[PDB]
RNA sequence: UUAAUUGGAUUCAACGCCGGGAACCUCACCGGGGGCGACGGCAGGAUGAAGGCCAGGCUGAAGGUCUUGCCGGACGCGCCGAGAGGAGGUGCAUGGCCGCCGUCAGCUCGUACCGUGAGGCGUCCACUUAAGUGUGGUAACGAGCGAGACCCGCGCCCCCAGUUGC
RNA sequence: AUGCCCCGAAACCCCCGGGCUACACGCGCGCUACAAUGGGCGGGACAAUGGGACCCGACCUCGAAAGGGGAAGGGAAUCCCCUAAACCCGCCCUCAGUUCGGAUCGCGGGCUGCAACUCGCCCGCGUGAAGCUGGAAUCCCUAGUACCCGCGUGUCAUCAUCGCGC
């Protein structure tokens, strides 16, 4: 099965946005922010930072 | 990260290398393709089923 | 395509099911397959010795038999029947199999020619032969021939007018190749 | 009436006029005017194979031959007559093709 | 000779033979890049994947590989029993199939007889034929496989059938 | 198919590229061929076995061509490849290593496929080699056979001076 991966930040009391959310998958899936480039792990996309 | 992918992508679509036989799984004999799809070794035993006759 | 080539494209399908059936019905004992092909549907009457392993336990084999023919066959409406073999000795494909069982046991070559050459002839036959290629349980290749009546004769006539069975009998030392040729009366 | 050409190709010597003079029986259920069986050629297929897998030395290769022998019958009759003929065509042995023209 | 020129065959019975398809494929052989092991068992489970992935840096292609940031839902690597697969080894271990000697006139049996026996006779002898083929003689009388006639085609005539024919 | 034994990121598995036709040679099996018994040019008389729906391709147009464009019919005694080739008559040539012979190669182009330097075929223009009748020695065949001429088919994208057949 597993071991070992988390990259989700933990907030207290409030809500934060770690990253951008895919607009092609709605919220749930968080884009990797390199500088200007967006990755998506759900299906695999090549995306640019809209 | 993760283990690679690989898949079958050989251009078998032309030549002797495209062919195969359903009755011995190979096409290394001298194959026949007109009519039936079988080889010469599956036409030593097959031929009088199909009404091919031994006599001349 | 042609109407000359419509005996090469139905006849092949008959070849394909003869080879697969003989092997998977040694649980019951195999003997033949009478395949009657109509555009309506292919009706295969399996001859087998035991009816109770060719119908299954509850249609277990019956589901296997429906699904098999359809891959091979252009007829997508197969029906199945099991008829019994009612003279095992009349047919050469139940004496190839009967002789194979006795060899796989270690029952020698002459000690099994009691029941596959002194029983087949009692049943009726113009001629019968048993041929046993192998090494004869040795280490070098040898064959032995047993012959009764007319079944080899001058010309193709009376030797390509036979009923014919081949079986494999497996040894842990080798293979032995089992030929029994009955030529029924005629 | 409607003209049918029944073209009947067979692998057997004696199944060819035995189903071209006794397919007149099958056919007739109403009145019919029928043409006696007209022999067309044997179209011959050869296929030659080596029986040798190794091929070596001197060898003898099997030339096979299947001869498919053709009769053509014309009949002028109703829909029902034509139907009898295409309703049954046995195991084949006998290939039956039908051509339909007025 | 080349990185390799893939292997067999190798007198008849190997050499336009498997190859009656030889640019990759084919292909076995060689070179470089990556990578799977079933089904049970074994520690592991949600402490997130076995799968996925921008962007340059690298691969003949694949986030494959790295820096780097990041998802969807959930069982299989590793091996140990033990299979699938191997165009993996051995055809002086084989089946199946084939070549040649040989489309040869040979090769066997039963009873009898002869001989301690192996065996002989018969299957020899004379004549005759492609043939252990046939005839007569004979201590022998008969039978089987092979070969002949049998099976298929080829020639001449008749009859049937007619869109071949005109 | 199969006894036995071995192999398990591997003698497995996937992929790209290569080689089997490399070459001073020798041997096996074929072909082309050495010219006036001739070739060219032109005309006229003649096929048979077979195969045929992303296939044979009528016929019509552009190209010397390879090939392309439009399009009829045909799953077959009924349409297509398809008119065979040898044959013969007249003229031209005037008998050379060439107007023989096609080796090798340049430039132009077609076709298949990811791709034809190594290993494709075909055309046009140039190139035009070796070869000028074969020593020792050796092989084939007995009648519709051999001597000799073309045609079709297979495998099949492609290599045919091959194989099977007419």
Nucleotide nearest to A2 (CA to C1'): E48
Q: Six-digit token pair at C46?
A: 């399996």
Provide, in whole angstroms, the distance separating residue C125's CA from nucleotide E152's C1'. Answer: 28
Distance from CA of B51 to the nearest CA of D (A): 6
Count CB-CB contacts under 10 A for residue A34. 9
Please check whether residue D17 is in contact with residue D38, taking contact to mean a CB–CB distance below 8 angstroms.
no
The residue of D5, D7, D8, D9 whose CB has the most chain C CBs within 10 angstroms, and thus the best one to mutate to test that interface, is D9
Q: Nearest CB to D95: which of C3, C36, C38?
A: C3
What φ, ψ does residue D64 adopt, rounded to 5°? Answer: -100, 175
Strands D94-101 and D2-10: antiparallel
Please give the C-alpha separations between residue C12 and each of B8, B50, C64, C91, C172, in angstroms, as whole numbers. 30, 7, 21, 23, 34
SS3 per residue for chain D: CEEEEEEEEECCCCCCCCCCCCCHHHHCCCCCEECCCEEEEEEEEEEEECCCCCCCCCCCCEEEEEEEEEEEEEEEECHHHHHHHHHCCCCCCEEEEEEEEC
Please state, in angstroms and rounded to a whole number, the distance separating the CA atoms of residues C51 and D86: 36
The set of chains that have 3 or more CB pairs under 8 A with C is: B, D
What φ, ψ does residue C145 adopt, rounded to 5°? Answer: -125, 135
Exposed/middle/buried for residue B7 (C-beta within 10 Å: 0-12, 13-18, 19+): exposed
Which positions ≥6 away from A8 have C-beta within 8 Å? A18
């Amino acid at each position: 099965m597993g071991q070992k991966w988390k990259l989700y930040e933990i907030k207290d009391g409030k809500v934060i946005r770690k990253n951008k959310f895919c607009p092609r998958c709605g919220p749930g899936v968080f884009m990797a922010d390199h500088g200007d480039r967006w990755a998506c792990g759900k299906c695999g996309y090549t995306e640019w930072k809209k | 990260m993760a283990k690679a992918d690989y898949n079958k992508r050989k251009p078998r679509k032309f030549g002797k290398g495209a062919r195969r036989c359903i009755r011995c799984g190979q096409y290394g004999p001298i194959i026949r393709i007109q009519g039936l799809m079988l080889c010469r070794h599956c036409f030593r035993e097959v031929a009088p089923k199909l009404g091919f006759r031994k006599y001349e | 395509m042609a109407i000359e080539r419509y005996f090469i494209r139905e006849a092949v399908r008959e070849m394909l099911i003869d080879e697969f059936l003989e092997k998977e019905l040694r649980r019951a004992g195999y003997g033949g397959l009478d395949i009657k092909k109509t555009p309506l549907g292919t009706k295969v009457i399996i001859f087998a010795a035991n009816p109770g392993y060719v119908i299954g336990r509850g249609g277990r084999r019956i589901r296997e038999l429906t699904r098999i023919l359809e891959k091979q066959f252009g007829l997508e409406n197969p029906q199945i029947e099991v008829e019994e073999i009612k003279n095992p000795y009349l047919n050469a494909k139940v004496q190839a199999v009967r002789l194979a069982q006795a060899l796989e046991r270690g029952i020698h070559f002459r000690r099994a020619a009691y029941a596959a050459l002194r029983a087949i002839m009692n049943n009726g036959a113009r001629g019968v032969e048993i041929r046993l290629s192998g090494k004869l349980t040795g280490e070098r290749a040898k064959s032995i021939r047993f012959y009764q009546g007319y079944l080899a004769k001058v010309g193709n006539p009376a030797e390509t007018l036979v009923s014919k069975g081949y079986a494999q009998a497996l040894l842990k030392l080798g293979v032995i190749g089992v030929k029994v040729a009955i030529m029924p009366p005629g | 009436m409607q003209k049918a050409r029944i073209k009947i190709a067979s692998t057997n010597v004696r199944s060819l006029d035995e189903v071209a003079n006794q397919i007149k029986q099958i056919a007739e259920r109403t009145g019919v005017r029928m043409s006696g069986p007209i022999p067309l050629p044997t179209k011959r297929i050869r296929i030659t194979t080596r029986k040798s897998p190794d091929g070596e030395g001197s060898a003898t290769f099997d030339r096979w031959e299947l001869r498919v022998h053709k009769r053509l019958i014309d009949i002028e009759a109703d829909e029902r007559a034509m139907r009898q003929i295409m309703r049954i065509r046995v195991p084949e042995d006998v290939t039956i093709e039908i051509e339909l023209i007025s």
